[PDB]
Amino acid sequence: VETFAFQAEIAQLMSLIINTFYSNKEIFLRELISNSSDALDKIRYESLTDPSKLDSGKELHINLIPNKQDRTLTIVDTGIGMTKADLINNLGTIAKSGTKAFMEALQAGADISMIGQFGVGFYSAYLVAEKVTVITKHNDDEQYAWESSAGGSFTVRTDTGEPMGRGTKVILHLKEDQTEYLEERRIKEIVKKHSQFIGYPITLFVEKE
Ligand SMILES: COc1c(C)cnc(Cn2cnc3c(Cl)nc(N)nc32)c1C
Fold this sequence. Notes:
Belongs to the heat shock protein 90 family. It is found in: Nucleus; Cytoplasm; Melanosome; Cell membrane. Residues 1-209 are annotated as: Interaction with NR3C1. This is Heat shock protein HSP 90-alpha. ATP binds at residues 35, 77, 96, 122. By secondary structure, the protein is of the alpha+beta class. It has one domain (1-209): Histidine kinase-like ATPase, C-terminal domain (Heat Shock Protein 90). The chain has four helices and eight strands. It has helices spanning 8-19, 27-49, 84-107, 184-194; strands spanning 2-5, 62-67, 72-77, 129-137, 143-148, 153-158, 167-174, 202-204. An eight-stranded mixed β-sheet has the order 1-6-5-4-7-3-2-8, with helices on one face. Strand 2 (62-67) and strand 3 (72-77) form a beta hairpin. The longest helix is centred in the middle third of the chain and has 24 residues, at 84-107.
């Protein structure tokens, strides 16, 4: 297991997200779904010029999986996935500029719900999650598990779990007071409100209870 420091700017963003009083936490789902939609668009586009990129799975979709036993909400997609380089360096690099702009915007009167406009919507996960575990598989790279409970560090390891074929699983380990996001009717409400025109099937799994 390798342990890495976030760049200071990203640590700062995560702190702001965790510490700021902001009631409209539900926007985290829309951001993650948007991210999944963008990853699906990317693999779809690449497949037009190299069809073998779908040898790791032709189906392009999103699954939302609540688990009350584990207190997790998992957002799964069969998008392009992330390389080791994405996890350790590239995403962080890109996020530095978006973070600065977002911070500036917040000082000028913007609110947290606008985070996606700055390309750093993933970190809104921390509105509701005490820990985020990301399982990902990109073509021509290995399956990785990234994890962070914030605090300035994250880990990356090669994943020995169920092989995914291609895609990303964002596993939200929900805060004790955020378990409404495990409830079917609440997830349906939020998807209808903020994610109604996504161009891929979104399947909301039901709890076995
Ligand atoms: C490791 O966790 C992330 C970090 C630290 C920053 N951004 C994203 C969003 N993100 C970036 N590329 C992504 C792809 Cl291909 N797919 C999805 N679903 N989300 C992505 C993720 C998941």
